[PDB]
């Protein structure tokens, strides 16, 4: 289900606005193209995808085995807040090759699930996960290549507000699923924390 508050927040966040390029595997999520050429997503689809992803995430009993990777500087704050509130693990900054296959590496873990923001910017992590039976969930724009991506979340990734909002909604939904916070009352935390603030 989609409510007016959520849709208006998304539109003010410009989450539904994408890129000129289009992929044959993302046309199911495209609603229309503007006159300039930018493609427009469908909010029902992205909301359903968020719900399904939250179900998949909560299915994991130990939150410490979920890995969040984000080399994009815009996403860092959002991923930190997501892990802190959801008790997950972050790999900010450069992803060291061998972090999943080299057991001598000082930062080595055996995650059960992997989360990403941009396959192109985090290509190395996805490849490594392909070697050790690790599924992945990622955020995808209108032009993304699905190479070992299991679940995609259609949304823009350039605008930092879009990045922070999506993680905030995901955390809200998973927390509601876990049984801590009910659906009716608004979550205490506000999205503005997830959006990076300058100076």
């Amino acid at each position: 289900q989609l409510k007016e508050a959520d849709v208006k927040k998304m539109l003010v966040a410009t989450t539904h606005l994408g890129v000129r390029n289009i992929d044959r595997r993302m046309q199911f999520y495209i609603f229309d193209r503007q006159k300039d050429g930018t493609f427009v997503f469908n909010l029902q689809k992205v909301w359903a995808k968020i719900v399904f992803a939250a179900r998949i995430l909560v299915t994991i009993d130990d939150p410490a085995e979920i890995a969040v990777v984000a080399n994009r500087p815009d996403a860092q704050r959002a991923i930190l807040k997501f892990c802190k509130y959801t008790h997950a693990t972050a790999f900010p900054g450069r992803f060291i090759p061998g972090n999943f296959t080299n057991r001598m590496n000082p930062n080595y873990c055996e995650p059960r699930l992997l989360l990403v923001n941009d396959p192109v910017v985090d290509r190395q992590a996805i490849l490594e996960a392909s070697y050790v039976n690790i599924p992945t969930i990622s955020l995808c724009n209108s032009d993304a290549n699905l190479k070992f991506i299991d679940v995609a979340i259609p949304c823009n990734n350039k605008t930092p507000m879009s990045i922070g909002l999506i993680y905030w909604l995901l955390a809200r939904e998973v927390l509601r699923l876990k049984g801590s916070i009910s659906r009716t009352e608004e979550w205490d935390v506000k999205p503005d924390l997830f959006v990076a603030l300058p100076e």
Binding site: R103, E110, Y131, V132, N133
Partner: protein, 209 residues
Amino acid sequence: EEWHPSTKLGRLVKAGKIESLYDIFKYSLPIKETEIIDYFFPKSELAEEVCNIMSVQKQTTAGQRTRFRAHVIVGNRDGFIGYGAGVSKEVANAIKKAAKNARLNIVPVRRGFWGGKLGDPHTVSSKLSGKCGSVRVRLIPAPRGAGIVASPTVAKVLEFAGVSDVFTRQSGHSRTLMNSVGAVYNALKSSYSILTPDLWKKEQLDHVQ
């Protein structure tokens, strides 16, 4: 000193939580510790053999730098076979590395019948083929009592895999030992990935392991 696990799977093996190797193979889990297998073969039931020893040289400003490359296979004669290689400045260390690599990678082998079904399977389930370099191999099921019709190198592998009846054909430059052994290894590995009408049964996935 004592085997200290370095992986979640290794720790599970240290505990008695998982009891069979077929459980690990059923979920395609990579193996990184040589102890994870020897625990399941405490009596050193695994055999060992050095197929070939070759010397490789590298030209340098002052003469050549020589090194040794070794190939090793291991099996318990009961549907398990492994193959590995190792390179080192010294022969013994190369042999140790090759043995370790061969132990690390191992595959189960499916066996079947030629016509009449009589208790224990005695030959390969069906026709299998492999490819490495220019070499190709064909393994064709044979009747009971037909022996192993194959070259000495391939026959040793088929023995260590626990087969008794089989017809073989080789093509290409088979005098290159490593590529022949790799082709037969790949053919055997493919066995448990071929669908048959007996496996058409539709089973629901289970939440174990």
